[PDB]
Amino acid sequence: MARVVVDAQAARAIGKGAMIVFKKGVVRVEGDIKPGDIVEVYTRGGKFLGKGFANPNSNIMVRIVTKDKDVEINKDLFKRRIKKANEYRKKVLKYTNVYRMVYGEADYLPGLIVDRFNDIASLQISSAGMERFKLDVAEAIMEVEPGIETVFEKNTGRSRRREGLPEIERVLLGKEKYRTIIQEGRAKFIVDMRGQKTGFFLDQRENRLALEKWVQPGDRVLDVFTYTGGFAIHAAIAGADEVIGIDKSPRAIETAKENAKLNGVEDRMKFIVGSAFEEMEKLQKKGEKFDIVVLDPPAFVQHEKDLKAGLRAYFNVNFAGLNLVKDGGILVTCSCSQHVDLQMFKDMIIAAGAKAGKFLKMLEPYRTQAPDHPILMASKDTEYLKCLFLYVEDMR
Amino acid sequence: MARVVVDAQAARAIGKGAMIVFKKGVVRVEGDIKPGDIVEVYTRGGKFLGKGFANPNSNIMVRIVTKDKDVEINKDLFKRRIKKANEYRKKVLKYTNVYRMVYGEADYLPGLIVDRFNDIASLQISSAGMERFKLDVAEAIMEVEPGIETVFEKNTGRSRRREGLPEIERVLLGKEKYRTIIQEGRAKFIVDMRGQKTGFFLDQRENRLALEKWVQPGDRVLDVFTYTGGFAIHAAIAGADEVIGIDKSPRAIETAKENAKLNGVEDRMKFIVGSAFEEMEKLQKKGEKFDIVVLDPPAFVQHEKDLKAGLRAYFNVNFAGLNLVKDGGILVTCSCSQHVDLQMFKDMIIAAGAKAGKFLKMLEPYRTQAPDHPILMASKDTEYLKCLFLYVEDMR
Numbered sequence: 178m179a180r181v182v183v184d185a186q187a188a189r190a191i192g193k194g195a196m197i198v199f200k201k202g203v204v205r206v207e208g209d210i211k212p213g214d215i216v217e218v219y220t221r222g223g224k225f226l227g228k229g230f231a232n233p234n235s236n237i238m239v240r241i242v243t244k245d246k247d248v249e250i251n252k253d254l255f256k257r258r259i260k261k262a263n264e265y266r267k268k269v270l271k272y273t274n275v276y277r278m279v280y281g282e283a284d285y286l287p288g289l290i291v292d293r294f295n296d297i298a299s300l301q302i303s304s305a306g307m308e309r310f311k312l313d314v315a316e317a318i319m320e321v322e323p324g325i326e327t328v329f330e331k332n333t334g335r336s337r338r339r340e341g342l343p344e345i346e347r348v349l350l351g352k353e354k355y356r357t358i359i360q361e362g363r364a365k366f367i368v369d370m371r372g373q374k375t376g377f378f379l380d381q382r383e384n385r386l387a388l389e390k391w392v393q394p395g396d397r398v399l400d401v402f403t404y405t406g407g408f409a410i411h412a413a414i415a416g417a418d419e420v421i422g423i424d425k426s427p428r429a430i431e432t433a434k435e436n437a438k439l440n441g442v443e444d445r446m447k448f449i450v451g452s453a454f455e456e457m458e459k460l461q462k463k464g465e466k467f468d469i470v471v472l473d474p475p476a477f478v479q480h481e482k483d484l485k486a487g488l489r490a491y492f493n494v495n496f497a498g499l500n501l502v503k504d505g506g507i508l509v510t511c512s513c514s515q516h517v518d519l520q521m522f523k524d525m526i527i528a529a530g531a532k533a534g535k536f537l538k539m540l541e542p543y544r545t546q547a548p549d550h551p552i553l554m555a556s557k558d559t560e561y562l563k564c565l566f567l568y569v570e571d572m573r
Numbered sequence: 574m575a576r577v578v579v580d581a582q583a584a585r586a587i588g589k590g591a592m593i594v595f596k597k598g599v600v601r602v603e604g605d606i607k608p609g610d611i612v613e614v615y616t617r618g619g620k621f622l623g624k625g626f627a628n629p630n631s632n633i634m635v636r637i638v639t640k641d642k643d644v645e646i647n648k649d650l651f652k653r654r655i656k657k658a659n660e661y662r663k664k665v666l667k668y669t670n671v672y673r674m675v676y677g678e679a680d681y682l683p684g685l686i687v688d689r690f691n692d693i694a695s696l697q698i699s700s701a702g703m704e705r706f707k708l709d710v711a712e713a714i715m716e717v718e719p720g721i722e723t724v725f726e727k728n729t730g731r732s733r734r735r736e737g738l739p740e741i742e743r744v745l746l747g748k749e750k751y752r753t754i755i756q757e758g759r760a761k762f763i764v765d766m767r768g769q770k771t772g773f774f775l776d777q778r779e780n781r782l783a784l785e786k787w788v789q790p791g792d793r794v795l796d797v798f799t800y801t802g803g804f805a806i807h808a809a810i811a812g813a814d815e816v817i818g819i820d821k822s823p824r825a826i827e828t829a830k831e832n833a834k835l836n837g838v839e840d841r842m843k844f845i846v847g848s849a850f851e852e853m854e855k856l857q858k859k860g861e862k863f864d865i866v867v868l869d870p871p872a873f874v875q876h877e878k879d880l881k882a883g884l885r886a887y888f889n890v891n892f893a894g895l896n897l898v899k900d901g902g903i904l905v906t907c908s909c910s911q912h913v914d915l916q917m918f919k920d921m922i923i924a925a926g927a928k929a930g931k932f933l934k935m936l937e938p939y940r941t942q943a944p945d946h947p948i949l950m951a952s953k954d955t956e957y958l959k960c961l962f963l964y965v966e967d968m969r
Binding site: 193194224265267270271283383390487496505519520523526527530531538539540541542543544545550551553554555564567568572 | 589590661665666667679777786862901915919920923926927932933934935936937938939941942944947948949950951963964968
């Protein structure tokens with residue numbers, strides 16, 4: 178088995194809880210290595226640090242799986258960890274039927290993400306090493322969670338492509354089922370595995386539920402990047418009198434309309450297919466003002482190098498959103514860009530508020546991704562979502 | 574009326590929403606100024622910027638009350654703002670009988686804090702300027718909120734001795750009443766305006782309520798700085814089998830015992846009068862472990878320059894607290910030091926976890942002070958409480 182020797186900085190980080198070896202921390206490699214191989218990690222002094230998945234072609238050269246030299250990496254190890262991950266959601270978080278079951282490193286299963294939608298589980302692998310155990314993982318999921326009757330492989334996305342793995346979408350194990358109706362609070366949503374723009378993201382669960390208490394009868398609500406209707410639907414079932422949802426994807430809007438029908442709130446909802454900026458300007462010129470405006474744009478920052486331009490994009494979206502909020506109204510604004518930290522997001526909102534001449538007060542704490550997407554204090558990369566609920570008032 | 578001339582930077586800030594003038598930003602003062610005097614603020618060019626309370630003995634020279642030269646600062650202006658502040662809690666936050674009614678600058682009433690405990694309003698003034706309108710504010714409170722039948726003046730403590738104001742404690746207006754029983758969720762608490770160890774702080778409301786969901790029947794809980802029993806009581810009624818509450822004040826513990834009796838949980842609790850560190854060391858020695866450990870220490874940091882020593886103290890308290898949490902347990906830790914921002918607090922927690930060899934996952938969003946203590950985005954000074962709920966796992 179190949180040995181990856183790392184430098185002092187790399188070893189120090191692992192000693193503090195890090196479970197990855199960056200290419201920049203590799204001093205040398207003893208033995209041949211191909212993407213996906215299991216290798217051992219050592220300090221220059223020959224001290225064993227751990228064993229894990231290697232990828233010589235990645236910034237993340239090694240994802241440590243175990244710090245115990247005698248522990249074998251196989252289906253049994255992953256099954257025990259998947260069971261632990263599942264129990265965490267059901268017994269600690271008290272989630273039922275619908276939740277993210279496995280969130281990579283946070284659950285000690287680097288490169289693996291598993292979402293449970295009732296009796297269907299979606300699997301996504303972004304580590305060449307973990308890919309070798311794909312089928313074993315699929316079997317383990319159904320063995321520890323009998324509620325799952327289908328494992329659907331959704332191996333697509335930036336992470337998948339970054340690792341150089343082929344994109345694959347198909348029923349991997351179990352019954353050939355790909356659509357289900359999930360319940361989130363009092364709301365229902367259509368979840369379909371096949372295709373895109375017809376999904377539902379679980380990371381915003383707590384924030385969507387948190388919105389309900391702020392909706393008041395007679396309320397007029399605007400969801401700028403509605404997608405399949407997550408926040409919009411929750412606002413409507415909460416009693417909003419009128420809700421307008423905007424999204425660039427025609428497919429996403431078609432599903433949103435279906436969700437509205439499923440929840441019996443089609444009468445109070447209007448979905449528009451189009452660009453956020455153009456649609457907001459039309460509303461602005463009309464002198465339109467909303468009681469609540471929700472901004473949940475796509476990650477504008479994919480690389481740390483794109484921060485400046487990305488933050489400018491957020492500034493422009495938030496400025497436009499703020500101008501559509503009535504005096505004494507509410508602005509809900511989020512960012513899913515991992516590279517944009519809370520402080521940066523906050524400074525950007527303060528700047529937008531200043532320009533729009535509005536005082537902003539916090540109504541909720543600094544919100545994040547749902548706890549089934551655990552934020553590990555020792556691994557900054559696990560955290561990516563920021564959400565703020567703000568009371569908007571004209572500075573006069 | 575005396576005039577304070579400011580530089581381009583200070584004026585620029587005010588234009589962005591700032592409501593203060595730092596003594597360092599004053600280019601010159603025209604006319605004699607006494608603490609509490611109302612003065613006008615102008616740019617070097619002669620443009621009016623605002624009017625407010627002056628304090629020639631502080632890093633903050635002026636607390637801006639109004640930016641309109643025509644608006645007179647008197648009881649009528651404050652009555653208007655106290656009413657707006659009160660409606661914010663009742664209509665937006667949906668609080669009913671117990672809440673902080675006014676939180677100084679956040680409600681455009683610098684130097685004034687008013688807490689409502691059912692029919693008793695507790696008033697605290699921290700500036701000489703506001704002190705001149707003390708009776709007018711008391712009358713205004715009862716005028717806009719008929720629910721208040723007594724206005725109690727609690728003008729004692731460091732916050733009061735800070736600006737050299739006289740210490741005073743008495744019923745200022747209304748019925749001679751000092752005690753009331755408040756309801757917070759399913760818990761009841763005795764509040765007595767007299768003294769300092771028979772009180773209850775409203776800023777932790779949402780965090781105390783948030784603890785409920787994490788308590789499992791049979792749980793053993795440790796409340797290290799329990800004061801009058803806030804968190805401890807909520808944990809006991811939520812189903813904890815044993816709750817140990819520690820506090821240095823014998824009087825605070827006497828109140829905690831009365832609160833336990835009021836909630837019918839006296840048999841589930843154990844109170845200890847002593848030092849936090851000494852008492853935790855005793856538990857550590859016996860190898861005691863808890864399902865939940867709550868750390869709510871005093872503000873260790875009081876000055877930017879005192880971050881090193883203050884943060885070291887937080888580290889020590891959190892390290893000691895972490896070693897008392899069982900594997901799979903929960904640590905609730907917070908800081909009320911204004912000078913310690915969220916990132917500094919996070920880094921300190923991360924350091925403590927690394928030293929104790931524990932992985933820490935967040936269970937709740939980044940929690941803060943209750944919304945009736947509004948955090949103004951344009952005024953960092955309004956935010957002071959940070960609170961984290963963490964799931965603790967042994968690294969080894």
